[PDB]
Symmetry: C5
Subunit: 285 residues, 5 copies
């Protein structure tokens, strides 16, 4: 009925918790699992390939980090759907954490060494551009497309890009804000983060939080604790409401790149994110 | 009547919301739209040209980032204007956000490579000087001119500079604070940000927020969330009042520069800003 | 099993304070103590050894920093565990501090010099990647394994790795989150920090706080004061409970590396951490099986 | 007579506002105004000159940034001065802002270029050591002298140094805290900031706020908004009192240095600071 | 007697304020005062001398920064010493400030120049590792020894080191936390800061605040204002109590190093710290 938020439902089972972890989608898929057939790159992207000229930029799909997303089912609520007043799940808060930064302390590998003159020192740790965004909502995250170069030739299959949505080539307006270029995060590991951003004009039922730090050798920084709670309630004390009984989790956590000893080839590094959402039942008209 | 702030108007349609996005004005105009005739630079400036001597500094108009601005209409109020007490629109708060920082993760292009020796590594991402300013008011943003060099030879057409206002050449005082060098942000993409700054001596009906980070290769930093509200009310609980039912939005969001493989040519990069303003009617004398 | 938390116990000895310091476990064990037989590296790791190829990475055990931990005995409370209502120790807060950052001001040693042309300047101070984590709980810290490379050939004896737990080689999923790879921090100086991380899915009775800063030459940063208290109480005002009356302290505090004059060999530097835990007795409905 | 603070005066004209802007004093005076005779350096210092030996360091006065200051008249108060209870002006708060950071976005000049191999790239922007201090009080800001080198041969004319005050050469104690080396900020553009610092042992009637960031190429950082109020009231709710009915404003705002294409000559850059002070009348014994 | 904290004493002279400044102890003593015989280094350390081998590290005493400290007398209290309830001085808060950062703006000296090829640019300002610690208490600051190298050969006279206390050579445990290595800061300019740290296991009657930033060329950062009060009261509202009517002040403020033109010789630079402590009388059992 009319989306008028009423009281908080009380009684047995009116509150619940949902846990989930989303693994990064940096480029290399989970399979093959073989550590000699490509599996060794899981959690990373494959070697970043550069444009050959100002008009020929064709990045490989497996070199492009994409959004991670999961749709989780919540326990049922309404029997009589035609009642004037119904119940709905409401996301109150979430404890989220990026796991694994300690693994970046491995500086004993075969990356580009710190002393390139003599090929000594330590294996250079992951550094560079970082990007962390997470969202919790009752609908898929609304995306707004914006790219560095509208001339970039993305593969037509394997990834969802602006052309996939509009059925036409990107225009110059796509390098700034073009209202026509919109989509929804409805698939895991398919929407490149260099193209799709959270849409501030929509997302009425989703709360998203993002931050970016660029550069080429910028030190990665991360905090992690099980004592930090992120409030999802808006200024009116109402959190995201699940209209379809399915909760949406979205995220991307890029730590930077590792660099090889062969022509400075860069590989993106991503880390998994944990979510623990507290939900409660809400009376809605 | 007299400028005395009274009570908040109550009743149907006493509160409203206005949304809008302002695209950056880095130098290259929206047209030509062709990706081979200049449109590929939309969202960026054209290649920055340098002075030829200590007395010959003539920057091209399309290399100078300018302020973005928009004037939005508000629904009408006053039936009888000659009344002792009238209603005025008052800006309470704004949810603003710079969209597209994820696009800076595109490091597969044709920019100056990180490994110049072998022309390998990755396409160097946008880095350098950053500038973010946004304002909301009931009048155009009041500007105060101040430049690096009063001898700079800006074009007389295509841009609004100190000379445009005073009808005379800049004087040495224009390198510090000269009360004579003032203007108002009344046109989009015309007032250069290296010349025009928010005037703290005026702007009684505007709230502006700005920050600057300089340097040549400083890592760009940006946060974005749909949960942050910017309060526009002053110390007395009063926000900007629309004296003429036209809301003014002003902004500039420079992320740094990208560098080409041809003589380190720099191109400024800017991103669009979204605004969602909450307004309420106010009884005024 | 019905962990129902009730009132705070009042009266004589209802509140207590535990103190302890945990020394870093960077690689070189406390012994031999001799300053010419290896003891001179205590507080540091031994020289970090690098992989010989993309498929041959065998780090030495003494080059891998591991978690520090201690289990402290609390005064006994319940002689009989069959009582409907019992008392349990609850951790309220902790004053913790990493000690010794001032020692990093020693730049008169024999590390790689800042003027390499003349072998002059100062002895380069410790810089680079930093990692600081501490935890207090009523059970061992729950760990989730995740590594940079599942092909890394860790020694089988001397350290507890994913293989030690699963009895099988690591799989590609171990480079991301693989639920199967879990363990508990039950031994000091045995679990490598580049492998084991606090498990957010568990640790229901432990509070952990960690931060990481990477890079190769990043300046080390640290604050220390005896005026800062870390609250251990959760959103409901209930801190970690000790069901077995053994309190667990865990930590790792890496300041970065020092670099020698011989082929830029790096040595991890760690510093000791102090803990002062405030505890109180809590009445609880019998949670014992 | 006695400084016993009583009630706040109420009634017509019991509160007032004072606005003022202080231009920077980096070295080059406001005149000559000619852009070919030296006026082109206004807002900057002249080229920094280095010591010729460990015992011969004599900086030119026009290369040393000095404190900016102004004394402003407040409206009159007492008719009868021989009364037991009088009224004094009290500074409650101040809105202050450093104007012009946007001008630092001019990277198209003739400074040392970022690409020295080809003399290309961009004109290196201002970078380095930054110093920001402002004060508001009822008496001149009390100064404590402390220098890098007690052997520095500061000019005897045109500047106020420690020797000017003591009538004797500096001693080694002047490199640390020497209680004898004190002065008052009673003149604009005369007291070098590398010599004179706010005295924490005095200034009972002044509030000062300062910060320093060193380095040679450190990125300049600055925030500016018309929504930030600095409270001037002390722990007992009392702000600075004007006993002589003359308000003192002091400041210095160094953004760093620009470097020329000739032997890396450095020129300090300063920016003007705006002040809007709110004052109220106070009953005093 | 019984260390029970009761009410605050009221009446005439029940509250007092103590002021003092502590000069830095970087290595060079205050004497000789001569600016040619060594006094020119006052406020700095003498040139840092390096180890000659992995087993021969003998730093000169004048190259080691030590703790600054002062014991201040407070006004008398108790007449009848054998009373059940006595009065003790309690430190409530302290306004502390590091003075002189502006002196670091002197870049016109004879330090290693920024353009070493041509011996041009500016005299490199102080940079590098920074250490700031201050304490206020009713007893000497309790110290815990911890060094980088237990093999370091510190001079036996002129400095108080671990061996001074234990009468035996340092052991490997001294590189971590060895409970045996403890001392008290009872002398000014004698305890090296690279050896002695605040002891968290003691100092029940002292409040200490410290921070450290390492690196070789890290920009020095510092804030200073007379508006910041540091609370010395613990969680129970009780501040440090002066048991033997002697207040202790301790500190160290290292800003970094300046580098000479001769073999990159480094000299530590320290700055003085000001203290203004507010104390009140307390009734104690
Ligand atoms: C397996 C293989 O060789 N595939 C070819 C593609 O190359 C691979 O592309 C990947 C990204 O898509 C990675 O860059 C691969 O690099 C790594 C990797 O696997 O991650 C980097 C690792 O560090 C390295 N590991 C080690 C230990 O060294 C591995 C390792 O060497 C190999 O896995 C085993 O040998 O390699 C990289 O090998 C190649 O991209 C594609 C397609 O090539 C095209 C394209 O479509 O992009 C063909 C087009 O016709 C051409 N277009 C034009 C106009 O010329 C483009 C163009 O050159 C390119 O866009 C420029 O960048 O190339 O072919 C596969 O066969
Ligand atoms: C097309 C062309 O060459 N036009 C001339 C102008 O040059 C262009 O100026 C732009 C800014 O106004 C950009 O700098 C252009 O550079 C880019 C660009 O288009 O953005 C940089 C891109 O990275 C590059 N792209 C690629 C893929 O390489 C493109 C690309 O090369 C071209 O678009 C393809 O053709 O180029 C740049 O080309 C030039 O500025 C003007 C005016 O020149 C004058 C002036 O009036 O300023 C003439 C004066 O007589 C002279 N005065 C004196 C005293 O010497 C000044 C002086 O040299 C200058 O002020 C110093 O900077 O130059 O002429 C157009 O014809
Ligand atoms: C005592 C000795 O030489 N042991 C050999 C190992 O060397 C030692 O390894 C340590 C790490 O485990 C440190 O790197 C040692 O370096 C230091 C140190 O003691 O910490 C660095 C100090 O800075 C230095 N001090 C000074 C003042 O200079 C000291 C000092 O030189 C010595 O303490 C006294 O001389 O040295 C370092 O000495 C060495 O790592 C192993 C290697 O053996 C193997 C292996 O890893 O098992 C054998 C394998 O068969 C081989 N595998 C393959 C496929 O080749 C691997 C492979 O090379 C390796 O994985 C590559 O990294 O090496 O041998 C010990 O005998
Ligand atoms: C006109 C002239 O050359 N005068 C000499 C002085 O030089 C000027 O000093 C200024 C600072 O006081 C600036 O550094 C001037 O540099 C600039 C400038 O004007 O700002 C830098 C600009 O970037 C540059 N502009 C351009 C576009 O290039 C301009 C420009 O070149 C000129 O303005 C054009 O004319 O120049 C700089 O020219 C110089 O300072 C004095 C030094 O004299 C003494 C002194 O300190 O009084 C004499 C003493 O006896 C001597 N002591 C000893 C023991 O030798 C000291 C000592 O050498 C000095 O302290 C070492 O640093 O110098 O001489 C004038 O002739
Ligand atoms: C005057 C002189 O040469 N004295 C010798 C001592 O050298 C002095 O040591 C100081 C630190 O204790 C500084 O490093 C001195 O450097 C400066 C300074 O005075 O601060 C640096 C200044 O920048 C510079 N000023 C200028 C304008 O250039 C001044 C200036 O040059 C002079 O002041 C003017 O003459 O110099 C530095 O001069 C030296 O420390 C002592 C003792 O030497 C010993 C020791 O440590 O006891 C002797 C031992 O026998 C030896 N041990 C071994 C095993 O050989 C050690 C060993 O070499 C050392 O441990 C390695 O670091 O040295 O001798 C004086 O003669």
């Amino acid at each position: 009925g009319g989306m008028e938020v009423l009281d908080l439902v009380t009684g047995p089972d009116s509150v619940t918790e949902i846990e989930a972890f989303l693994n990064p989608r940096m480029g290399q898929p989970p399979t093959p699992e073989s550590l000699t057939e490509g599996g060794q790159y899981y959690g990373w992207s494959r070697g970043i390939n550069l444009a050959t000229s100002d008009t020929e930029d064709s990045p490989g799909n497996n070199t492009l980090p994409t959004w991670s997303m999961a749709k989780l089912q919540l326990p049922m609520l309404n029997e009589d759907l035609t009642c004037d007043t119904l119940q709905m799940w409401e996301a109150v808060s979430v404890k989220t954490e990026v796991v694994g930064s300690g693994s970046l302390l491995d500086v004993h590998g075969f990356n580009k060494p710190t002393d390139t003159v003599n090929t000594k020192g330590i294996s250079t740790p992951v550094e560079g551009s970082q990007y962390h965004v997470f969202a919790v909502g009752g609908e898929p995250l609304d995306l707004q497309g914006l790219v560095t170069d509208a001339r970039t030739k993305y593969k037509e299959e394997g990834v969802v890009t602006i052309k996939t949505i509009t059925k036409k080539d990107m225009v110059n307006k796509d390098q700034v804000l073009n209202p026509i270029s919109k989509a929804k995060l409805d698939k895991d590991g398919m929407y490149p983060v260099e193209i799709w951003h959270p849409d501030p004009a929509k997302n009425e039922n989703t709360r998203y939080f993002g931050n970016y730090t660029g550069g080429t050798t910028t030190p990665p920084v991360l905090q992690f604790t099980n004592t930090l709670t992120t409030v999802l309630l808006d200024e009116n004390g109402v959190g995201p409401l699940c209209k379809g009984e399915g909760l949406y989790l979205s995220c991307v956590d890029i730590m930077g790149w590792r660099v090889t000893r062969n022509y400075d080839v860069h590989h993106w590094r991503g880390l998994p994110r944990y979510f623990k959402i507290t939900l409660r039942k809400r009376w809605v008209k």
